[PDB]
Amino acid sequence: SMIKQRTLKNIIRATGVGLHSGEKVYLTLKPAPVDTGIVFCRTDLDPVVEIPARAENVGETTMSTTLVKGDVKVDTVEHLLSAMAGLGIDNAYVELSASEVPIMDGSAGPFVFLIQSAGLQEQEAAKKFIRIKREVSVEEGDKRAVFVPFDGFKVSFEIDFDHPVFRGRTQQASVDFSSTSFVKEVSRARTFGFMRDIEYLRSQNLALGGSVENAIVVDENRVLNEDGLRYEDEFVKHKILDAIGDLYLLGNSLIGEFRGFKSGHALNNQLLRTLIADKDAWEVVTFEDARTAPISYMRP
Ligand SMILES: C[C@@](CCn1ccc(-c2ccc(OCc3ccccc3)cc2)cc1=O)(C(=O)NO)S(C)(=O)=O
Ligand SMILES: [Cl-]
Ligand SMILES: [Zn+2]
């Protein structure tokens, strides 16, 4: 059959705290109709404020990706959107009782488990993909983010931290997500920060909820987390996780390759905005036969 749009089969709930705000938040994921996309909903407000998870609604990109509408924000959407992208979820309502998505364990692991526990549901409309037709890039200083054509979906990333826990380590990685490798390869890679920064961060209303329970905390000469890493390359894998979530602000799954070099949320957003304006560089495609498509998906 054709590759169909997907939504959630049943309502999913989670409780947590925002990484940056420290505020307790109740998360509710709900099914949504065809061509809704992912829409965030601030249900603590009356009337509610609904913000589509689209590039056009990105405000700040300092230490997270923040959606904005009116005076209202939804902060730190990248890890939940990475889970949505990784599982191929087209349509969903994401209700929040506060201004930031719960950080959970710092990865997309809890989200992919909660979603897959409930299950997905295929919808009777063709899934739409954005296919990269020619190279699109943005740079700022030594940072760079690039889309190149690729028959599938692949993400590569390189970091360069002038830090003794990073020097001499694997700071580059490439993952092919044309099959069902997202869950195994990157979903559990945790966010990370530096103990040295915590006073400055907190003064900016950042990392107020951060701890070893939801982040890899890096001290001057060692990782603070006593229990160890989930992957020897967990840092660069998390950057890949972030990129997948930020890229999903395009509103559809990508057929192409992303390469990040010391990039982050700000440059990811700039890349999407120039791609969207550069219309000859991309097209929208569907697949009436899943067997002939370049990306394959798990059963719902
Ligand atoms: C932007 C990033 C990273 C986001 N993040 C994550 C964690 C912390 C962060 C957490 C805890 C910290 O210290 C806790 C502490 C301090 C003293 C003693 C004990 C314990 C410091 C810092 C800060 C921060 O900004 C991203 O994942 N966005 O999606 S990233 C990886 O792309 O830089
Ligand atoms: Cl950046
Ligand atoms: Zn992250």
Catalytic residue ranges:
265
Q: Are the beta carbons of 82 and 107 closer than 8 angstroms?
A: no
Asked if 150 and 264 sit in the same domain, the reply is yes
At how many Å resolution was this determined? 1.5
Closest CA to 92 of 11, 21, 150, 146: 11
Exposed e or buried b per residue across 184-222, where buried means at least 16 C-beta atoms within 10 angstroms of its C-beta: ebbbbbbbbbbeeeeeebeeeebbbbbeeebbbbbeeee
Other Cβ atoms within 10 Å of 15 Cβ, number: 11
Domain count, the chain: 2
Pair 165, 104 in one domain: no
180 contact partners, CB below 8 Å, separation of at least 6: 296, 297, 298
Question: Is the Cβ–Cβ distance between 272 and 147 less than 8 Å?
Answer: no
Cα separation, 45 vs 272, whole angstroms: 29
Tell me, in angstroms, the distance from the centre of ligand 3 to residue 289's CA. Answer: 35
The answer to whether residues 167 and 287 belong to one domain is yes
Binding site for Zn(2+): what residues are annotated?
79, 238, 242
State the distance between the two ends of the chain, measured CA to CA, in whole angstroms: 14
Q: Are residues 124 and 134 in the same domain?
A: no
Q: Is the CB of 74 inside a 6 Å radius of any atom of ligand 1?
A: no
- For 276, the 3-state DSSP assignment is helix
CB under 8 Å to 113, separation ≥6 — which residues?
none
Angle at the Cα of 76 from the Cα atoms of 106 and 233, rounded to 5 degrees:
40
Q: Is 191 a pocket residue for ligand 1 (Cβ < 6 Å)?
A: yes
Q: For the domain that residue 85 is a member of, what is the CATH number?
A: 3.30.230.20
Q: What are phi and psi of 110, to 5 degrees?
A: -60, -40
Per-residue HEC secondary structure of 100-148 comes to: ECECCCCCCHHHHHHHHHHCEEEEEEECCEEEECCCEEEEECCEEEEEE
Are 117 and 68 in a shared domain?
yes
Last residue within a domain, chosen from 128, 159, 175: 128
CA distance 122 to 4: 6
* The residue to which tokens 């490798």 are assigned: 181
Look at residues 111, 128, 145 and tell me which one is the last residue of a structural domain.
128
For residue 69, what are the CA distances in angstroms to 41, 54, 55, 73? 11, 12, 12, 6
Cα–Cα–Cα angle for 224, 228, 234, rounded to 5 degrees: 100
How far is 190 from 211, CA to CA, in rounded Å?
Answer: 12
Please state whether 264 falls in left (phi above 0), alpha (psi between -120 and 50) or beta: beta
Helices (H) and strands (E) in the chain, counts: 6, 18
Q: What is the span of the domain harbouring residue 177?
A: 129-300
**Concatenated DSSP letters of 58-92:** B---SSS--EEETTEEEB--HHHHHHHHHHT---E
Q: Domain boundary residue among 65, 93, 128?
A: 128
User: Do residues 142 and 282 both lie within one domain?
Assistant: yes
Residues 101 and 11 in one domain: yes
Q: Which atom of ligand 1 is nearest to the CA of 64?
A: 28
Same-domain pairing of 261 and 158: yes
Q: Are residues 114 and 138 in the same domain?
A: no
3-class secondary-structure state, position 279? helix
Let me know whether 214 and 243 are in one domain. Answer: yes
Residue 254 Cβ inside 6 Å of ligand 1? The answer reads no
CATH label of the domain that carries residue 222: 3.30.1700.10
Dist CA 143 CA 267 (whole Å)? 8
**DSSP single-letter state for residue 24:** E
Residues 108 and 81 both lie in one domain: yes
Asked whether residue 185 falls in the same domain as residue 55, the answer is: no
Experimental technique of record: X-ray
Q: How far apart are CA 108 and CA 47, in angstroms?
A: 30
Tokens of 71: 């005076």
